[PDB]
Design a protein around this ligand. Sequence first.
Ligand SMILES: *[C@@H](C)C(=O)N(c1ccc(C(C)(C)C)cc1)[C@@H](C(=O)NCCC(=O)OCC)c1cccnc1
Ligand SMILES: *[C@@H](C)C(=O)N(c1ccc(C(C)(C)C)cc1)[C@@H](C(=O)NCCC(=O)OCC)c1cccnc1
Lengths: 304, 304
Amino acid sequence: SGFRKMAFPSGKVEGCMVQVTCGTTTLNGLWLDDVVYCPRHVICTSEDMLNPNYEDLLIRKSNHNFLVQAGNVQLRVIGHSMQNCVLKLKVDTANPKTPKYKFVRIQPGQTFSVLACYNGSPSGVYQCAMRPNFTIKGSFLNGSCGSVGFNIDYDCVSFCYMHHMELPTGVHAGTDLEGNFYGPFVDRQTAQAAGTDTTITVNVLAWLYAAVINGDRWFLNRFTTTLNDFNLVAMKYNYEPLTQDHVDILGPLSAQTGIAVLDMCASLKELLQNGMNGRTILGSALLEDEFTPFDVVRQCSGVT
Amino acid sequence: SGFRKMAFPSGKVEGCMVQVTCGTTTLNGLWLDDVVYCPRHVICTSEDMLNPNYEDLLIRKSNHNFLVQAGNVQLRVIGHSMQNCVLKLKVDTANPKTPKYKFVRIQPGQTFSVLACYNGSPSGVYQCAMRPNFTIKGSFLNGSCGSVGFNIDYDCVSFCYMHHMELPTGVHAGTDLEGNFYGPFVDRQTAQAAGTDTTITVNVLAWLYAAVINGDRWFLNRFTTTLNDFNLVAMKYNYEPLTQDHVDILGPLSAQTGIAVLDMCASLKELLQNGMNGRTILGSALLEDEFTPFDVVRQCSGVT
Ligand SMILES: *[C@@H](C)C(=O)N(c1ccc(C(C)(C)C)cc1)[C@@H](C(=O)NCCC(=O)OCC)c1cccnc1
Ligand SMILES: *[C@@H](C)C(=O)N(c1ccc(C(C)(C)C)cc1)[C@@H](C(=O)NCCC(=O)OCC)c1cccnc1
């Protein structure tokens, strides 16, 4: 028992982190096979952060200008290309620690672990969620760019995020491993305000199921609701609308606890309307939304 | 910017996890050099969980009865001994992935990361704190025994905890790597109630400093207090007493933010007396106490 914000074991990803330097900018790169992936803004100086023309800036760069270091040893760059907002640096050596991997583009509400790195070295691992406004609430300092987000299925790492920037509001923006930003964000120092950070309703319900499984049951009420009634309350509280797909995904948790999804929705509705009244659920005084139904099942079953 | 409950990168510890089986019980072991460390209750059956006599149970066990498997390969056990509540299984092979390591016994309030494992395989990593009542609020299912807690200083892993059991209240009890339990807990299925889980005051202050550094300043008030006045309020709220050592340890955070420790104590005092009023600090609706002053500095500076 017990329920924690758990990240995937980071070992497989630690073995992929390298340092990339271009001119005076140093950030992190992800080394998979003979390719090092990093944010294309590694080529940017100070005088051109406001409106960079990446194709133009890249013309002035050659293979030897990208310094890639894995541990304390230098990798030889034999090719470079820009794919969307990422640079792909072909090196002459395949990473011997390359795990089985995939590049996936996640949807909002989906969770992943972040291996925060500086100078190609891992500093920490934490669990994130792609917010409905396509930002992530990470912990990233200068030099953390190129740190990646991932999920692991047994021995296959699915890379889903690469850190690129921090918005003026202290929230984070990044790309998938094909270089496409999540959301409307661009890699330039400009006014980029995030949209409404709504609560991931399906995740909150999953976490309420995790609370019941772990003995926290005080919030369970005598009520039920409908998807349409619940959604009127969810809209009022800036919660994402709950769909029949979400109800279906919560089915295994509903089955394990014997609590119908719509009954849990009614409990959630009363929590939104009445508040916690100074009480806690799984050690939290707010409704946690960064656990998917899959994470709750995985953690409560012990998937390795 | 951004502040997350961050665990250490787990790679160095993943390379040490093995599966230990004795009879029909399978748990995790920690393989460092040619020794595999695991909870001694791996020798216990069902008929003797209530009052085990470990020395007597161990007489019936030989080296060949302890099955150690690292990955998909079996290790040869050439010796076994009991040190307090841990078994040390000498194997014929030194772990090639043994990192630089130390065994440390932490104090209450100190934090560490847990690599939760099942069948010698890592499932997840999370950050814990040794509670003032010597329990940990972990996430551990059956078979998680032998999972370890650790801190990392650059390339040296300091192992501080090994998971042994879950108390009837769903909190966790374990030992240091010398086999000595934290707190008064024993490895037997008996009535073991935990003491008062007080809040780690120095950690809350560290986290309030982290909030100020990250832009969350609404709780900063116009007041100050003394250590004795603050401690009268801390006692009332089941917070640990704050000492001059704690004030000294918070010095770098006080220096970085320009907020005197006793002024932050007065802010904390008003938060205890008035509540959050539905507001949040660093995305939390309660006062977080599982970040030490060292963790706040490390995370806010980017130590790798
Ligand atoms: C990470 C590489 C870094 O230190 N930056 C950063 C990212 C992107 C640029 C760019 C303007 C050339 C694309 C420059 C520097 C930090 C950062 O985001 N700075 C603010 C600029 C920005 O993002 O403007 C968009 C609104 C950074 C700091 C902390 C955490 N992550 C990134
Ligand atoms: C972990 C090895 C395990 O599955 N146990 C466990 C631990 C200790 C014993 C022992 C009674 C022989 C020492 C047996 C089994 C779980 C556990 O703690 N069971 C309850 C017995 C207990 O701890 O009694 C003391 C009050 C366990 C489950 C979930 C998480 N951790 C451990």
